[PDB]
């Protein structure tokens, strides 16, 4: 059988996301979760649907900013994975509370 290295999912999945800019996170569970975090401050809110699209690509943009900086902060320290000190230094340098 044909088989090639665990860990060499890298470059083919690199192009496999990179050609397409469709929204990564699956939609209506994400609707459920934003509905649930919103639902416990004030009543009877709805969403407009393109507002869900807006907050969806907002979390997409902020997450890709997050682990792009943890990616190069991981390679800052001769390291091949990301781990918890990497994301914690990202959340040091974030500047936003």
């Amino acid at each position: 059988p044909h088989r090639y290295k665990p860990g060499t999912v890298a470059l083919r999945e690199i192009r496999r996301f990179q050609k397409s800019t469709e929204l990564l996170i699956r939609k209506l569970p994400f609707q459920r979760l934003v509905r649930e975090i919103a639902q416990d401050f004030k009543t009877d809110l709805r969403f407009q649907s393109s507002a869900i699209g807006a907050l969806q690509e907002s979390v997409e943009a902020y997450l890709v900013s997050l682990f792009e900086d943890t990616n190069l902060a991981a390679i800052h320290a001769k390291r091949v994975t990301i781990q918890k000190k990497d994301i914690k230094l990202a959340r040091r340098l974030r500047g936003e509370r």
Binding site: T8, L11, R15, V64
Partner: protein, 108 residues
């Protein structure tokens, strides 16, 4: 041939009644010259062009005819000349630029 000041009395292509309206809608005090202000039409003309010319740049790169959004984000990260004009550049379903780093490839 015509007795009508046809709104491009410089020769530009954006609506000047809209520019009079936007100047009297930012509108702090009370007297604000709406006659001189075609020198902001020229700035919104210059960057109409400073996005649509690199629209025309990456229009060949995807072999389209219809201009769309991922090519808009590759043009929004054309270059440091225009990253900084829109410091927070993320446009809807824009994706990202293609980037592997020099770190992970080691011929393994």
């Amino acid at each position: 041939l015509r007795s009508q000041s046809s709104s491009a009395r410089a020769g530009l292509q954006f609506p000047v009644g809209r520019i009079k309206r936007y100047l009297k809608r930012h509108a702090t005090g009370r007297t604000r010259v709406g006659s001189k202000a075609a020198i902001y039409l020229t700035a919104v003309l210059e960057y109409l062009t400073a996005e649509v010319l690199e629209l025309a740049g990456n229009a060949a790169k995807d072999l389209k005819v219809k201009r769309i959004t991922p090519r808009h984000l590759q043009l929004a990260i054309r270059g440091d000349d225009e990253l900084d004009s829109l410091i927070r550049a993320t446009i809807a379903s824009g994706g990202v630029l293609p980037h592997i780093n020099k770190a992970l490839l080691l011929k393994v």
